[model samples]
Target chain A: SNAMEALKRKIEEEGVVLSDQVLKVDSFLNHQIDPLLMQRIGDEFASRFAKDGITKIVTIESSGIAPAVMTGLKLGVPVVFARKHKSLTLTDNLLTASVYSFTESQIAVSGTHLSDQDHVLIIDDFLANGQAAHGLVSIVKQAGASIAGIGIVIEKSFQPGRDELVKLGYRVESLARIQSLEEGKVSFVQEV
Target chain B: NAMEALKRKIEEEGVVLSDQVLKVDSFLNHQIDPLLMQRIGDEFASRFAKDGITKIVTIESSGIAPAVMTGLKLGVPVVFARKHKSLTLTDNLLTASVYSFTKQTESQIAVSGTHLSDQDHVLIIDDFLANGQAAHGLVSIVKQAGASIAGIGIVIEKSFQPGRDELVKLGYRVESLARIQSLEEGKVSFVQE
Candidate 1:
């Protein structure tokens, strides 16, 4: 919770408002990463899910990777990320699912580096519409692996993401929850 | 000593696709081993400790994992080059062209100009070194920023190729954990240190 407060401060300081719908945390979250902050974020997630008995940490490619890697390091578990583009090395043994991005009408298939024996914990940088998170959950189910929980860095509480995951019977923990981001100003959900 | 652990993992988990390609998806790129990645970061940090590296630069996708670990070990920030530029990344971007041998295609990579300044020293990190095209692209990006390259660290190297030799010829210090001498009958032969 202290880390969440620190993250909120950092976001207030450096987070840029591109538009009403888009908020950029590139200074410390996405494009340019602060490794120390990432480690703390990882530690917080590890503490929240310490008793879940997670076997693997799963995330999407690019931005979600940094925090996921840190969580994996802290938990001493392996990290596997789903790629947008399947390379020559990805064989036919992969479990796949379709993810619909709100930015586009089309859908893309993402594969999980998982097995039926795994107990998966999903990690990500942001949770807005919960589309990407759903895709990852689908992959875990396709592999017949049990879901431990989902760890998110920043969640837009104004959106329907939390309710959607909660309806599906998932325990979702976010480091920082944004109550509002209207007119270039940011607000947080009250801490309990 | 840590490199030996990486070597043993490679021997056990690495999948040889023909004699020219090796797939380490289970440990290196796709399905990552965080413990191994931590060791890799420590190894690079130990090797480049005296170089005074202020930042770590790597390309997006697979290279981000090891680079993040190295940045953590070295107590520095990490800036990774994006293969595709989004609307968020607008003007004043430094761009370079990199050829992918595995995909048989060439793509342009870009990095923000603000992340790297002339006052910084950078270390390049990646998962593999084959044709050295990606390495060359990253080096050019650092040069464009007027920053000096401390060194380049690779997890695996195919010694049969000219990648390491080419980077060495360019006067950049290159370090690889495992150097593959040959791949025959699905077996990897390492070049002696």
Candidate 2:
């Protein structure tokens, strides 16, 4: 609970609000990474999903690698990051891809690292629109494995990622939840 | 001490693709073993901890894991040069052209000028030092930032190639944990020194 505040603190200091719909965390989370912070993030996710029987950790490279590796290390599981030939977007923007939910064959993916008997935990750096997370869920479904949960480093409350994933009946746990990013200022969704 | 563990792990699980390409995907890059990565981090940290490292610089993808782990140990920030064609959102980017042997394509590697600076002492880290192409590009970018190059830290050094020798000739200190003397004929022979 306190660690979540730590990430919020980092975002407040280093995060750049590029647009109303986008936030730039390149200084600490995306481009330049803080391993000590990532270690705490891993601890938070591990504690949140400790009893889910998570067998594997799946994430997309290269931003998500730090957090995923940290979580996987704490849980003592392997991490498999999907490769992308295209340049990664600065922010996990609101513009959702058409094949967002889950496409059979789109680009960059795995099999050996996953199995039908395994329970997967899909982790990512951001959850803005839920498209990337859905694609991961689709892949996990393809492998015939059960999804234990979706652990996100940052989630935009104004966005639909949390809603869509929850609608899909998947347990979504986000460390830092953003309530608003308007007028170049970041506000979080505080506990009521 | 831990480098020996890495060398043994390399010999045990490493695949000899050819004289040039060696695959350690089972543990190093493709599928990560966090325990081993932690050990590797400790090794790199101990090796360069005294250099007054202000930052850690490395290329994206494979370089990230090792560099991040080391960054954690050193209590420094790790900046990975972007290797994609997508236009970055931020301006004032420090750019360098990098040639990849694995992809067989030319890609532009980028780092934000805001992140790197003259006041920073950068310790460059990566998974492999084969052609010295990646390492050279990283050095070039660091130089543009006016940053001091503390040293070049590599996980695996292909001694069969001229990467280490070339970097050494340039007066740069290069430390590679596992030095492979040969990957020819599907055999792994490590350099004792």
CAPRI band for model 1: medium
Evaluate residue B55 in candidate 1 and report its C-alpha lDDT on the 0 to 100 scale: 95
Kindly give the stretch of ten consecutive residues in candidate 2 chain B with the minimal lDDT sum.
Answer: B83-92
- Count residue pairs with overlapping backbones in model 2: 0
Each candidate structure's TM-score, on Cα atoms with residue i matched to residue i, is: 0.95, 0.92
List model 1 lDDT by residue over B1-193, tens digit each: 7689989998998888886688888887778898889899999999998889999999888889889999999999998898885647764699999987767989999988878899989999998888899899999999999999999999899988889999999899998988899887888999998
Alpha carbon lDDT at A78, candidate 1: 88
Instruction: In model 1, state the lDDT of residue A192.
Output: 69
Per-residue error (Å), model 2, residue A139: 1.7
For model 1, how does the per-residue alpha-carbon lDDT over A1-192 read when each residue is reduced to its tens digit?
Answer: 577877888899998877666778877887788998999998889988888899999998888899999999889998988877756576666666676666432222224466788998999999988988988888888788899999999999988888899999999999988888888888789876
TM-score of 1: 0.95
> For residues B50-89, could you state the per-residue lDDT of candidate 2 as single tens digits?
9999999998788888898899999999999887643243
